[PDB]
Amino acid sequence: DLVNKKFPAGDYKFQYIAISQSDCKMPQTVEWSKLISENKKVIITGAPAAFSPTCTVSHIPGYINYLDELVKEKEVDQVIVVTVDNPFANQAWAKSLGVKDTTHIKFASDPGCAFTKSIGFELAVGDGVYWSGRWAMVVENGIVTYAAKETNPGTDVTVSSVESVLAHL
Amino acid sequence: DLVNKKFPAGDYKFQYIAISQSDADSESCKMPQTVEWSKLISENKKVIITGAPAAFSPTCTVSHIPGYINYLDELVKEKEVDQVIVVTVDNPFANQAWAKSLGVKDTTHIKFASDPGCAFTKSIGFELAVGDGVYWSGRWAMVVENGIVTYAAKETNPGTDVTVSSVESVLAHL
């Protein structure tokens, strides 16, 4: 592959719930095409499951920790964390991870894994159920600069990690 | 269809993560257990199964789940409910966290089950379409006594109704 091709938004939509904090929000639908057309530097990273336990690997906390560097120093407009979980759960997870502001980091639901499947970064979990795998993607000016998924999302944080991504920023 | 028929377990399985007293307010590192519904029913005379559309549905929105949790002691202690199974299509970790966020400190008698891809819930027609072939569970309750569905009811607008899915409506059938 996707690298150096236009970001394949198609008609795919994600939902997320803002966090202001800065003090019952509800899911906003956002078109990938709009998000990508409206934002020059977008990091998108898939996670298999909201509330995956801390005792297992996760790349997401890296993204949260480096959020400030990404946004201030590396001019990242939007970090979209993508799961197939419902948007409330993804919101709750985001807060659980210390997201206090979704200006630049949104925990997107990709309902039915459809966007994630469409780029082949899905994770079959049985019976035609798809979670997202673990992957990261950099889109720059509508172009996929970087797209990689873990071969084993359950143990691997390599190509999806913020460090790897940061290397492509 | 369902009332007064054997619980239609089929091959449907759910997943849940246990919450014991060793981890009720701590972050858990438990693998989801997969449990076939036939196994649940087989081992528990008296089971309440109730679907919800979304783990972590906002606390400002109407939900039947808190009632199940508040009535849980009564259900177990006075109504001999063996299990309350709260079903969503959300991942078992989300569900377990949700359970914790609702005060569940013990899954002995209540479990927040994942019904992946809404397959079981669809199978009983109690789902909630939410766009593009995506199904959440509707809001519904069901009582299974000795393998037999004694009560099954889905809200018409799960968004807004907590009537037949409510623990009170259920209580009034136990």
Swiss-Prot record, chain B:
MF GO annotations: thioredoxin peroxidase activity
- The record's account of how the chain is modified after translation: Conjugated to URM1, a ubiquitin-like protein, in response to oxidative stresses. The attachment of URM1 to lysine residues exclusively depends on the presence of a peroxidatic cysteine in the target protein, with low specificity for the particular residue, motif, or structural context at which urmylation can occur. The URM1-conjugation reaction is mechanistically and directly coupled to the process of cysteine persulfidation, transfering the sulfur atom of the URM1 thiocarboxyl group to redox-active cysteine residues in the target protein if it is exposed to oxidative conditions.
Report where the covalent cross-link Glycyl lysine isopeptide (Lys-Gly) (interchain with G-Cter in URM1) sits.
Answer: K30, K46, K77, K79, K105, K122, K154
Cross-link Glycyl lysine isopeptide (Lys-Gly) (interchain with G-Cter in ubiquitin) - where?
K46, K79, K111
What's in the GO CC field?
A: cytoplasm; cytosol; mitochondrion; peroxisome; plasma membrane
Q: Which CDD domains match?
A: PRX5_like
Key words, A-Z: Acetylation, Antioxidant, Cytoplasm, Disulfide bond, Isopeptide bond, Oxidoreductase, Peroxidase, Phosphoprotein, Redox-active center, Ubl conjugation
Q: Does the keyword RNA-binding apply?
A: no
Q: What SUPFAM superfamilies does the database record attribute to this sequence? A: Thioredoxin-like
Enzyme kind, highest EC tier: oxidoreductase
Give the catalysed reaction(s), semicolon-separated.
Answer: a hydroperoxide + [thioredoxin]-dithiol = an alcohol + [thioredoxin]-disulfide + H2O
Q: Which GO terms describe its biological process?
A: cell redox homeostasis; cellular response to oxidative stress; hydrogen peroxide catabolic process; response to metal ion
- State whether keyword Transferase applies: no
**What is the purpose of this protein?**
Thiol-specific peroxidase that catalyzes the reduction of hydrogen peroxide and organic hydroperoxides to water and alcohols, respectively. Plays a role in cell protection against oxidative stress by detoxifying peroxides and as sensor of hydrogen peroxide-mediated signaling events. Preferentially eliminates organic peroxides rather than hydrogen peroxide. Relays alkyl hydroperoxides as a signal to the transcription factor CAD1/YAP2 by inducing the formation of intramolecular disulfide bonds in CAD1, which causes its nuclear accumulation and activation. Involved in cellular Mn(2+) homeostasis.
Q: What is this protein called?
A: Peroxiredoxin AHP1
